[PDB]
Amino acid sequence: PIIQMNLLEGRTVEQKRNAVAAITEAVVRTLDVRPDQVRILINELGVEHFSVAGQTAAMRQ
Amino acid sequence: PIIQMNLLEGRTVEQKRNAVAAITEAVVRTLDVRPDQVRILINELGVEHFSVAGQTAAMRQ
Amino acid sequence: PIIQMNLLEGRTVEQKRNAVAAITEAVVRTLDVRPDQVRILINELGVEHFSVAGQTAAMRQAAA
């Protein structure tokens, strides 16, 4: 499995590392694949680069 | 709907904000969904990170 | 600009065609690009293939 995770900027390296560990463990358990078959790509989005209902995260904040 | 928009770097915050408003309004009208069901992710591409016919934007410029 | 639009399955061709025209003109106007620089790719998602808060759109429809 190849997982792309888009999330807002602001997260510390610890939190990104905890997330890729935990999501890998979830995929390995639920789909019964090996850890090395799970790749995660993190795309961080600037607060002007993510919108809901036509307002960016910056505007909502 | 979840919309990912890849566009070249260089645009001002106003222009990104105008684009996410206008695209949201288009999706809301044409598909009859609520504004909060429309999410837009902007991926900005560096001029060496986008190519047409094997030349990057930088080279074309 | 290259736009990927992910939608749940089931929309009529007319609505997809109207969205593609409306999104294109939104991008042309707000980003000052020509129409031929605007490409949209539509990815339809089956109801078993989209989730919010850990429930798929299929299960959410089923529960209603």
Next chain:
Amino acid sequence: PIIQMNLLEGRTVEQKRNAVAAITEAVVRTLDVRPDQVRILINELGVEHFSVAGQTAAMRQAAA
């Protein structure tokens, strides 16, 4: 967070549903977001549409 998961074809609905719940709760816990902020999109790949080292999963299965 918006998560796209690309999987080879053929998994049972139950496994997809368990993955979607497990991934969501992994993201909620580690990223301190609510469940309703977590969307997952699943893209299934046909065996002719995924390759490692220049051979498709179809050809790799065929060779075994």
Next chain:
Amino acid sequence: PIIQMNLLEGRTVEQKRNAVAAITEAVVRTLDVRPDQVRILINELGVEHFSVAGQTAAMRQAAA
């Protein structure tokens, strides 16, 4: 490297297999990575699901 290739529908398996081999070797040579570090995912687009200048490939074929 992970490569997603979005193509219009309709290509023969042989052409997809030749593209996957040729793209992989292009990446190996120019990026100095091993073949097993190169994955390609192919996404086929229906003609109603791809547009240039606000017209879908279906409508563009229809008009010709």
Next chain:
Amino acid sequence: PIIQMNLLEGRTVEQKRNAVAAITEAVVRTLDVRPDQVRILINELGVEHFSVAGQTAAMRQ
């Protein structure tokens, strides 16, 4: 064809340019499309933004 290439940060402009040329040539030959029908988008990933088996590239290094 529209190609998105995700690769780890660290590559020089020459190497990115050589890659988009070579991949374009491959697509043009194998699929018999024109060069201007091939667009490549490069997404560079930070070493904390790519994982295999639940470890980021940074951790593996």
